[PDB]
C-alpha cells in the first residue's frame, strides 16, 4: 500500500560540493564535475545543513515499486561523489591458451584495437565512452586499466571490450579467452 513517507540521506564529504538545479544533481570536486538528471524518478531532493553536509531524498505516498527508487537515487549520488573524489579504476586481465590477445590504445584512451584474438585476422576496434580513458598497464603483463569519473561510462566501456572479445560457435567452457574485468577499484584510495 501507499507508504505515508520514506526517505534517506546521503552524507556528502567536505571536499566535494553538490548542487541541485531542481532534480538534476551536479556534483563537483577534485577530479571534475558529474551532472545527472533524475527527472523520471519523482522525488524531493532536499539539500540541508550548513556547510551543505547532507543530501536528503524524501518520497511521499510511495507504493512498493515507487519506494524502490529512493535508495537507487541515493546510491547513484554516492557513486557520483566517489567518481568526483577518487575516480573509478576498472582493471581487466586478458586470458588465453594460445593467441595472446594483442591490445593497443590509440588516440588517447578512446580507441582499443584488439588484435590476434584466437588467431583471427579481424582487428577489433573499440571506442570508449566520452570521459573514460583506457591505458595499457605496467607491473602486470596481460592487463588493461580503464579510469574515469562516471562509473556508468567506465563499466560500459569495460563491457564493450569484454563482449568484443567473444567466442562464436565453440565450446565456451573449453575456450576461455578474452579480456575480462578482474577488479573494480579507485584511482586513489585515501
Amino acid at each position: 500500500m501507499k507508504t505515508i513517507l520514506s526517505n534517506q540521506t546521503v552524507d556528502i564529504p567536505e571536499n566535494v560540493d553538490i548542487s541541485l538545479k531542481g532534480r538534476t544533481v551536479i556534483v563537483k570536486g577534485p577530479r571534475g564535475t558529474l551532472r545527472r538528471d533524475f527527472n523520471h524518478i519523482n522525488v524531493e531532493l532536499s539539500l540541508l545543513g550548513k556547510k551543505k553536509k547532507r543530501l536528503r531524498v524524501d518520497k511521499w505516498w510511495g507504493n512498493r515499486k515507487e519506494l524502490a527508487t529512493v535508495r537507487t537515487i541515493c546510491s547513484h549520488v554516492q557513486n557520483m561523489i566517489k567518481g568526483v573524489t577518487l575516480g573509478f579504476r576498472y582493471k581487466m586481465r586478458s586470458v588465453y591458451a594460445h593467441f595472446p590477445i594483442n591490445v593497443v590504445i590509440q588516440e588517447n584512451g578512446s580507441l582499443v584495437e584488439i588484435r590476434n584474438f584466437l588467431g583471427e585476422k579481424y582487428i577489433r576496434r573499440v571506442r570508449m565512452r566520452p570521459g573514460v580513458a583506457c591505458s595499457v598497464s605496467q607491473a602486470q603483463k596481460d592487463e588493461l586499466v580503464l579510469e574515469g569519473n562516471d562509473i556508468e561510462l567506465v563499466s560500459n566501456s569495460a563491457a564493450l571490450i569484454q563482449q568484443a572479445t567473444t567466442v562464436k560457435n565453440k565450446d565456451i567452457r573449453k575456450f576461455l579467452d578474452g579480456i575480462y574485468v578482474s577488479e573494480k577499484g579507485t584511482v586513489q584510495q585515501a
Binding site: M1, T3, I4, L5, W60, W61
Partner: protein, 175 residues
C-alpha cells in the same frame, strides 16, 4: 444484498410461541444493511443458519437503527469476515479506520469487491469491534497512529477540466 452506505441495525426476534414452548428466547443481532426492509431479511438469513427458525416460524420483535455513539471520534475498527472465493469459503480479519461502524463495514464491502472481486451476497460479517492504537495488526492502519503526522499533497492533479474546456494557460499542479 446490495449496498449504498450501510446502517447498523439491531434486530431482535423469536421463534413464535406455542403450547409446548410458551415464552421462547429472544435472539438479537447486528445486521448492517441499507434499510430495515433488507435488514429484517438479513436477520432471518443469519438466524436460519444458526437456529431452527424461519420467517414463518418466528416474529421479529424489534428492528431498530443503531447510531454511532462517538461519530466525531476517529476510530480503528477490526472486522472479521467470512467470504466466498471462486474457490472455497474463507475467513479474514480486515481493519479499517473510520468515524463509524457503518462507515467501517461499508468501507469493507468496497475493499472486498476491489481486492477479491467478492460481491455482497458472498460476504458474512461476523464481528465488528472498535480497537485501540495497539491491537492493530495491519500496517496500512498503523502508519496513521502518530502524534505529529505530516505529509504533503504532492502532484495535485486538477479537476474542473471542463471549466475552461479550452484555455491559454497550461495548468498547475504544484501547491
Amino acid at each position: 444484498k446490495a449496498s449504498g452506505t450501510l446502517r447498523e441495525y439491531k434486530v431482535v426476534g423469536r421463534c413464535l410461541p406455542t403450547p409446548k414452548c410458551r415464552t421462547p428466547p429472544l435472539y438479537r443481532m447486528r445486521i448492517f444493511a441499507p434499510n430495515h426492509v433488507v435488514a429484517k431479511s438479513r436477520f432471518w438469513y443469519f438466524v436460519s443458519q444458526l437456529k431452527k427458525m424461519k420467517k414463518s416460524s418466528g416474529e421479529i420483535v424489534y428492528c431498530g437503527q443503531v447510531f454511532e455513539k462517538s461519530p466525531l471520534r476517529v476510530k480503528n475498527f477490526g472486522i472479521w469476515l467470512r467470504y466466498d472465493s471462486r474457490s472455497g469459503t474463507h475467513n479474514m480479519y480486515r481493519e479499517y479506520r473510520d468515524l463509524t461502524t457503518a462507515g467501517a463495514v461499508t468501507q469493507c464491502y468496497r475493499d472486498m469487491g476491489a481486492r477479491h472481486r467478492a460481491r455482497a451476497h458472498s460476504i458474512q460479517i461476523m464481528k465488528v469491534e472498535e480497537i485501540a492504537a495497539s491491537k492493530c495488526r495491519r500496517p496500512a492502519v498503523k502508519q496513521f497512529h502518530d502524534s505529529k503526522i505530516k505529509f504533503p499533497l504532492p502532484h495535485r492533479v486538477l479537476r474542473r477540466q471542463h471549466k475552461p474546456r479550452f484555455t491559454t494557460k497550461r495548468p498547475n499542479t504544484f501547491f
